[PDB]
Amino acid sequence: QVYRLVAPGPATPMLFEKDGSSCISRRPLELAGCASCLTVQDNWTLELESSQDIQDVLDANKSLPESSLTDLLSDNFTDSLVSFSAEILSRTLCEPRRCVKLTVALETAECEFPPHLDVYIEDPHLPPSLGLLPGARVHFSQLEKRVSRSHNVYCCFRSSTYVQVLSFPPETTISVPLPHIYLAELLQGGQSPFQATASCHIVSVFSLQLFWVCAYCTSICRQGKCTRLGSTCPTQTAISQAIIRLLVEDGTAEAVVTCRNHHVAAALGLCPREWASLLDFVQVPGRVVLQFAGPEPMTMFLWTLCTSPSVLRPIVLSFELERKPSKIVPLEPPRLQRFQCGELPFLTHVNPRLRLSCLSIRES
Amino acid sequence: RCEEETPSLLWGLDPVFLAFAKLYIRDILDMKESRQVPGVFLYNGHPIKQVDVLGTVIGVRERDAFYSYGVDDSTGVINCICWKKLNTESVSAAPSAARELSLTSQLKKLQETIEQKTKIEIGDTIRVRGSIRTYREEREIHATTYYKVDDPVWNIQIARMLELPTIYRKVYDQPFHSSALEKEEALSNPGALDLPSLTSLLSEKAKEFLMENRVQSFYQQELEMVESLLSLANQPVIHSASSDQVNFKKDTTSKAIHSIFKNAIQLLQEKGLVFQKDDGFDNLYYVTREDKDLHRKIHRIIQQDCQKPNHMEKGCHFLHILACARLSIRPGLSEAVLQQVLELLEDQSDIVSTMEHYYTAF
Amino acid sequence: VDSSHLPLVKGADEEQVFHFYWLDAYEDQYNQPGVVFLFGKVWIESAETHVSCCVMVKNIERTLYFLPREMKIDLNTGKETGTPISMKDVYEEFDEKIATKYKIMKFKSKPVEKNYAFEIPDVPEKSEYLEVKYSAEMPQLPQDLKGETFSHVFGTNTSSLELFLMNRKIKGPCWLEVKSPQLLNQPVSWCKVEAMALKPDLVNVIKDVSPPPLVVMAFSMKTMQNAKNHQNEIIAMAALVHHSFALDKAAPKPPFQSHFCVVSKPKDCIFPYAFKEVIEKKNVKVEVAATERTLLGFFLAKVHKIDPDIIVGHNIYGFELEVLLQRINVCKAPHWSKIGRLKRSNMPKLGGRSGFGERNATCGRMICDVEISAKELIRCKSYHLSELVQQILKTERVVIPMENIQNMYSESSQLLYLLEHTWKDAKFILQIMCELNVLPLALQITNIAGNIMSRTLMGGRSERNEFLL
DNA sequence: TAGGGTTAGGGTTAG
């Protein structure tokens, strides 16, 4: 916008050129030796001009500047100032360094599958500005960008940050179905989505783990007793956890899928009562770990179940790429293996496997 | 022209190689075997190793070691050998505790369910997965996994028949994989197509030349003397894009050559391989790898944990090391130069890195 | 030692030559075909000692043998055509068909006479063969190639290392002389001195110098098992190093001259109170590592700096080397190749049943497992470490179960006792190795057989006798 | 200083 200073008083020259050294003139610590300073006075006021008068200057009221996606997602980018427009997805409060972690989905006209990003708001500014709610569209300007230990990209909140709210959250949260793709499209690096569904068929199982951990110190329990009880936990509370690593394909490509918690019971095709009985049985020794491939009636039952055609069944899987879009580390060259079909081993160049994560598993 | 098959080294790059392909039985019977390796077939250039079929059983034959079936998919009839898994050393049940007794009962129920699922007669519907083989001039599928599909309304086969043409059109009727794209190796002779690409190739060519000679210091005009680098840079693209002067054609060509060399040198400086000093020479550069004194100073600084207190946790962060070096050695130090110095120091077994962007002394 | 000059020694013909004593050889045809590496010690006049050296040999030529047919037979029909077979006919057919089909631009041929007395039939006892030699870069011909004049072809898949060893009459570790060495601008090995020979013909054998002393290290480590993924981690390890271990007399006394120890902590527990102060008061050279990655980096740096030639221990190949490689991969410790001598990027596949990748993981060095040597040498009730100590040295050894390992971090005294126990175990392993004279016996066996020295320690008697034959 | 720990696993025969 174009603002006009309408400071009243006598027509004293130089008053709009520089701050008088001998008069009232103070500067912030970050502006100690500035060549141009003009302190505003209390009696001074501001006004807004019309559009027609300054249409030439106001013709530059295009979209606010936004850094290129390549600049934003490159670690070699030494500049630590970025700006973008995004839509807030979820807001959470972090407590011990008080932080309000924000998850924003970018909006750009370059890539039709914008990546996700995290914005952290720390203590110096923590009456966070009004309007920062899930579902709204907000424009962030001049954020600090840093690369973490795990090569992730996240934007901090510095004293030179300007935040403007554009649209309010919708009254009704409409639903959207995930796209339906083949698993081969993710191996072609041209604009592929990272959250879709596919009709895969289970092939094998790599491992399976079941625990009974302590609710406070997250240590393996035995009959509802912490191993370090009396030193790290004040009560006797036990919760269950489960991991599994499938290996699915859908007629075009191969991928390995990791599932957690109740998705384990969903993938195994077990009723809730059977799942509860299995967990109760597991509660006795404390842990059950099986490594079918990779570097007791319960064991035999699990081994039989993991190879029967009751598990290796066609399913419909809604998956999310394990490597987050923010992460940047392309360093994988093709490998070389020794497949042998007709008693005549040969050598081929193979690509690294696709790693996924489960969100929902349904039968068909 | 006889279409030469894809080389046997690039077969694994195709995603279809490791996936159970859905194909018509007529296609399975009609594909041509590959001469390079028997047992692996070709369909439109795609190296297909495994198949997936669904059909109606029309004939059951049993031998002492394997079953035989005929799968009809309304397009053709093929055999499907199903091997017999030996039930040697059957699990012995024992009258254990009540929970273990329930587990054994559930195991017996699961075994009965599996045995019911694997029972097949004439007229049923079967799904067979496995690999193609040739035996006595006959093509057949050696099944890996197979079970009887319970389809009482004929929805699964209808869905399969509706789905197969779409998968064919969108995947199988496509040219080939992407192995080093198309002439990604080199740039189709030093002429190339993109002028910045020419600048980049000249840049790391000059970098390689400087490394191989073990150059300590060099000048841009010295790099201009190199006939090989000049010949590599002398391409139609730069000459055609530098015709901004008529009376000074040679002069403007030399100026464009100087500009492209400066761009290459600044690209190298961005990587930190070469660093500059304020010695009055605008084109004087020193190779970072050969600066032994900088390595010694950095190692000496690290050995004291950047003058941090001993009770403070040993080691330093990358930013802390950079700040200490800037305040102590030279304010003009760049991050890339420091990173290269640290990597070179670690290569010679001088420092050990504990976390990422964290380094400690021995 | 500066890398701009090589320790050349003047020869009898007033020509400076390279002299060294090779120990182990490595070959990699998939990446650099026709290249064989040699490692060993080279005398240095500046310090009057021996340092590790790497020698590169290039341009190894394959050899093929063709058996001419008695009477011409058409390939298409398998019937005679009415003409005899001559050597020039075989050469012309080869040049006109095989070179065109398999893209063999350059080759050398000459008539030779050879004998065959093996199980393959349809081969005369004595005949004349066609010997064709060409570089390894051109593709290998099929093993079952048959033509209008040659029925069977030999030497299709002969490894470069075997050909180089056979054609130069090298019998185990022996002194070598290299004529006209050339410096390498790009280092490829971790050794001090590097050189390369253009052709294999520039290497000869000298048989008048006693073997030089080597460097030997014995090490052991303690591994605790994680309770959530059944993975084995590393908590502490120790080693002992000798610098002048001879190979032609009794073991030196004392068996060791220097040692080091490093102790780490698990992810959950912390060190006992004032553990650093306790260590300092006792005045014992024990280095504390913050994490497992620090421990692995320190161990690799110590291995690289000490530069050992022979590494010994108990149950290395089966368990310890695999565990160490897995931990290096998981912790993403950089520069894993320091455990060997040749710069490599891609770690070989782990978990191999035959252990071929695990065996190749330490090319250029020596891995001596006391278990296999004990099995080959003497008979005992069992080959566990405690039983071996009881039967050989007649001493009692304490066994620490995995259950107490978690509890040893309660007090500093328990941690010191565990570290001392590991040190004593390493010392016992070294003493057991020195007792049986494993190294001189292995050297004598290798010299008699003539095979590679490193393969002798693997117990492959069939390999040694195959090489001898 | 901001993701938990992290890496990589099956790749063959029988008539």
Strand partners, C310: C216, C366
**Strand D nucleotides within 7 Å of a protein CB:** 1-15
- Cβ–Cβ < 8 Å for C135, C59: yes
- The verdict on a CB contact (< 8 Å) between C294 and B362 is no
On the question of a cis peptide bond just before residue C254, with omega within 30 degrees of 0, the verdict is: yes
Cα separation, A325 vs A194, in Å, equals 8
Reading phi first (left if > 0) and then psi (alpha if -120 to 50, else beta), residue B302 is in alpha
Instruction: Calculate the angstrom distance between C1' of D13 and CA of B29.
Output: 24
Whole-angstrom distance, CA of residue B250 vs CA of residue B243 = 10
User: In Å, what is the separation between the CA of A244 and the C1' of D8?
Assistant: 15
Supply B18's token pair. Answer: 């490791």
Residue type, C448: I
Q: Give, in words, the CATH class of B11-172.
A: mainly beta
C-alpha–C-alpha distance, residues B200 and B263, integer Å: 9
| DSSP calls for A131-145 | T--TT-EEEEEEEEE
C-alpha distance from residue A264 to each of A276, A360, C175, C229, C322 (Å): 13, 10, 64, 17, 31
Do residue A287 and residue C228 have CB atoms under 8 angstroms apart? yes
Q: How distant is C1' of D1 from CA of A136, in Å?
A: 28
Q: Which of B214, B315, B362 is opposite residue C301, by nearest beta carbon?
A: B362
Token digits of residue C340? 């060997």
CB atoms under 10 Å from CB of C303, counted, come to 21
Nearest in space to A289 (alpha carbons), one of A213, A206, A209: A209
Interface test with B, best of A186, A199, A339 (most B CBs within 10 A): A339
Angle of helix C321-331 versus helix C292-306 axis, rounded to 10: 120
Please state the domain extents for chain C: 61-168, 214-465
Contact assessment for residue B77 and residue B58, using Cβ atoms and an 8 Å cutoff: yes
Task: List alpha helices for chain A, DSSP H.
Answer: 55-58, 69-72, 262-268, 272-282, 297-307
Cα distance from C56 to chain B (closest Cα, Å)? 19
B11-172 and B195-288 agree in CATH topology: no
Contact between A211 and C350 using a beta-carbon 8 Å cutoff: no
Q: Is B279 on the interface with C (CB under 8 A)?
A: no
Which residue in chain A has the smallest CA separation from C330?
A295
- Of all helices (H) and strands (E), which one includes residue B327? helix B318-328
Fill in the DSSP letter of residue C222: E
- Report the C-alpha gap between C444 and C448 in whole angstroms: 6
Distance CA A253, CA A187 (A): 8
CA distance A126 to C327: 43
Tokens of C358: 């695990």
CA atoms of B316 and B357, how far apart (whole Å): 9
Residue C441 DSSP SS3: helix
Tokens describing residue B154 = 């004929």
Q: Nearest to residue C363, comparing CAs of C333, C345, C339, C382?
A: C339
In the block, tokens 């079929």 appear at B53
Interface membership of B4 toward C (CB under 8 Å): no
Give the list of residues 6+ apart from residue A48 with CB closer than 8 angstroms, or none.
Answer: A1, A2, A3, A4
Amino acid identity, residue A309?
Answer: P
* Spatial contact of C371 and C383, defined as CB atoms under 8 Å apart: yes
> Per-domain residue ranges for chain B?
11-172, 195-288, 289-360
Q: Cβ(C134)–Cβ(C107) under 8 Å?
A: yes
Beta bridge partners of A259: A244
Q: Which two tokens stand for residue C99?
A: 């070179």
Q: Report residue C435 as tokens.
A: 């007792």
CA–CA distance, B360 with B350 (Å, rounded to integer)? 10
B12 and A252 in contact by Cβ < 8 A? no
Q: Closest Cα partner for B341 from B271, B264, B268?
A: B271
Using the Cβ of C126 and the Cβ atoms of chain A, whether some distance falls under 8 Å is answered with no
Q: Which residue bears the tokens 């141009």?
A: A36
Q: Of the candidates A182, A339, A344, which has its C-beta nearest B38's C-beta?
A: A344
Return all residues near A230 (Cβ < 8 A) that are at least 6 apart. none
Output Rg (C-alpha) for chain B, integer angstroms. 35
Distance, in Å, from the CA atom of A345 to the CA atom of A359, rounded to the nearest integer, reads 39
Minimal Cα–Cα distance from C442 to chain B, Å? Answer: 33
> In terms of CA atoms, which chain A residue is nearest residue C230?
A289
Cβ contacts of residue C413 below 8 Å, gap of 6+? none
Residue B349: list chain C partners with CB under 8 A: 300-301, 304-305, 338
Beta strands per DSSP E along B184-256: 217-219
Residues C372, C361: Cα–Cα separation, whole Å: 19
Give yes or no for a contact between C239 and C217, defined as CB atoms under 8 angstroms apart.
yes
A346, B37: Cβ pair inside 8 Å?
yes
Residue window 280-339, chain A: list those with CB within 8 Å of chain C: 287, 289, 291, 294-295, 335-336
Integer Cα distance of B177 and C387 in angstroms: 59
Using an 8 Å CB-CB cutoff, list chain A residues near B118. 309
Q: Give the method of determination.
A: cryo-EM
In CATH, which of 1.10.620.20, 3.30.70.2820, 1.10.3720.10, 3.20.20.10 is domain C61-168?
Answer: 3.30.70.2820
How many residues in chain A? 364
SS3 B224: helix
Sheet hosting strand B41-43, strand order edge to edge: B32-33, B41-43, B46-48
Joined tokens for residue C382: 């069992």
Q: Which stretch of DSSP H or E encloses residue A105? A: strand A99-106
A182 at the B interface (CB within 8 A)? yes
Q: What CA–CA distances, in Å, run from C174 to A157, C276, C382?
A: 69, 49, 37
Distance of CA B57 to the CA centre of its chain: 42
CA proximity to A101, closest of A150, A153, A156, A145: A156
Whether B41 contacts B32, CB under 8 Å: yes
- Chain B interface includes A234 (CB < 8 A): no
| Residue A306 in tokens | 């993991």
Residue A29 in contact with residue A70, Cβ under 8 Å?
no
**Nearest-CB residue to B354 (from C186, C293, C300):** C293
C327: nearest nucleotide, CA–C1' criterion: D7
* DSSP single-letter state for residue C197: E
Residues 6+ apart with CB under 8 A from A359: A318, A319, A320
CA distance B206 to B225: 12
Reading phi first (left if > 0) and then psi (alpha if -120 to 50, else beta), residue B186 is in: left
CB C299 within 8 A of CB C305: no
* Residues on chain B touching C186 (C-beta within 8 angstroms): 212
Q: How many CA atoms lie within 13 A of C260 on its CB side?
A: 16
Look at residue B18 and give its three-state secondary structure: helix
- On whether the CB atoms of residues A328 and A74 are closer than 8 A, the answer is yes
CA distances (Å), origin A341, targets A359, B49, B319, C158, C414: 36, 9, 54, 24, 56
The domain B195-288: what is its CATH number?
Answer: 1.10.10.980
B103, B117, B357 member nearest A297 (Cβ) = B103
What angle (nearest 5°) sits at the alpha carbon of residue A259, between those of residues A254 and A263? Answer: 125
Q: What DSSP designation does B307 have?
A: T
Contact list, C350 vs chain A (CB under 8 Å): 295
Minimum Cα–Cα distance from A293: chain C residue = C351
* Coil, helix or strand at residue C201: helix
- Which of C10, C29, C27, C18 is closest to C53 using CA atoms? C18
Mutate to test the interface with C, among B214, B351, B352, B357 (most CBs of C within 10 A): B352
Q: Name residues 213-232 of chain C within 8 A of A (Cβ).
A: 227-230
Show the DSSP H helices in C244-284 as ranges.
275-282
> What residue type is assigned to position C317 of the chain?
Y
Residue in B closest to A248 by C-alpha: B19
Give the C-alpha separation, C260 to B300, whole Å. 23
The Cα A253–Cα A251 span in angstroms is: 6
What is the rounded distance in angstroms from the CA atom of residue B164 to the CA atom of residue C417?
Answer: 69
C-alpha to C-alpha distances, C38 to C20, C191, C359, nearest whole angstrom: 10, 11, 17
C-alpha Rg value of chain C to the nearest Å:
27
Gap between the Cα atoms of B173 and B19, Å rounded: 16
The CA distance from C373 to C383, in Å, is 10
Whole-angstrom Cα distance, residue B84 to residue B64?
9
Please give the C-alpha separations between residue C335 and each of B353, B362, C364, C371, in angstroms, as whole numbers: 11, 16, 16, 29
What is the pairing mode between strands A46-48 and A3-5?
A: antiparallel
What are the two backbone dihedrals, phi and then psi, of residue B133, each rounded to the nearest 5 degrees?
-145, 160
A146 touches chain C (CB under 8 A): no
The verdict on C290 touching B (C-beta cutoff 8 Å) is yes
Q: Please tell me the distance from the alpha carbon of residue C129 to that of residue A14, in angstroms, as a whole number.
A: 107
CA to C1' distance (Å), from C416 to D4: 34
Our CA angle for A240, A241, A247, nearest 5°, is 150
Distance CA C316, CA C429 (A): 12
Residue B3: helix, strand or coil by DSSP? coil
Terminal Cα-to-Cα distance of chain A (whole angstroms): 58
Pinpoint the alpha helices (H) of C81-152.
Answer: 87-93, 99-102
Q: Give DSSP secondary structure letters for A314-348.
A: B-EEEEEESS-TT--------EEE---SSS----E
* DSSP symbols for C387-435: HHIIIII--------HHHHHHGGGSHHHHHHHHHHHHHHHHHHHHHHHH
Tokens of B283: 């084109």
Cβ of residue C97 closer than 8 Å to a chain B Cβ: no
Neighbour tally for C207: CB within 10 Å: 7
H-helix or E-strand spanning residue B323? helix B318-328
Supply B19's token pair. 């996936």
Radius of gyration of the CA atoms of chain A, in A = 29
3-state SS class at B101: helix
Q: Give Cα separations from C397 to B111, B171, C394 (angstroms).
A: 50, 66, 10
B/e letters for C370-403, b = 16+ CB within 10 Å, e = fewer, are: bbbbbeeeeeeeebebeebbbebeeeebeeeeee
Residues of C in contact with B315 (CB under 8 A): 290
B217 CB-near residues (< 8 Å, 6+ apart): B284, B285, B286, B287
Class of CATH domain C214-465:
alpha beta
Tokens describing residue A196:
């879709």
Residue A108: what residue type? T
A151 to chain C, any CB pair closer than 8 A? The answer is no
| Calpha distance C300→C234 (Å, rounded) | 14
**Tokens 């069992």 label which residue?**
C382
Chain C residues whose CB is inside 8 A of the B313 CB are 290
Q: Is B298 exposed, middle or buried (0-12, 13-18, 19+ CB in 10 A)?
A: buried
How far the first Cα of chain C sits from its last, in Å, is 42
User: Closest by alpha carbon to B38, among B134, B123, B122?
Assistant: B134
Token pair for B33:
């075997």
Query: What are the CA-CA distances from residue C338 to residues A220, B345, B347, C191, C239 (Å)?
Result: 38, 15, 10, 10, 17
Is A184 close to B110, i.e. CB distance below 8 A? no
Rounded Cα–Cα distance for residues B47 and B33 (Å) = 10
C neighbour chains, 3+ CB pairs within 8 Å: A, B
Strand partners, B327: none
Angle between helix C412-435 and helix C275-282 axes, rounded to 10 deg: 50
Q: Is C350 on the interface with A (CB under 8 A)?
A: yes
**Torsional sign, CA B71, B73, B77, B80:** negative
Give the minimum alpha-carbon distance from B257 to chain A in angstroms, rounded to a whole number.
Answer: 27
Burial class (CB in 10 A: 0-12, 13-18, 19+), C41: buried
Question: Is C6 strand, coil or helix?
Answer: coil
The residue written with tokens 């071996």 in the block is C388
Token pair belonging to B228: 């090989």
List the chains bordering chain A where 3 or more Cβ pairs fall under 8 Å.
B, C
CATH class assigned to B289-360 = mainly alpha
CA-nearest of A269, A272, A279 to A209 is A279
Q: Return the axis-axis angle of helices A297-307 and B98-117, rounded to nearest 10°.
A: 20
Measured between alpha carbons, how far is B201 from B263 in angstroms, rounded to an integer? 11
Breakpoints of chain B, after residues (C–N > 2.5 Å): none
Report d(CA A270, CA B106) in Å as an integer.
12
Of the candidates C239, C175, C237, which has an alpha carbon nearest to the alpha carbon of residue C207?
A: C175
- φ/ψ of B316, rounded to 5, equals -140, 155
Element (H, E) at A240: strand A238-249
The answer to whether the CB of C18 falls within 8 A of the CB of C205 is: no
Beta bridge partners of A82: A143
In 3D, which of C167, C124, B178, B193 has the Cα closest to residue A351? Answer: B178
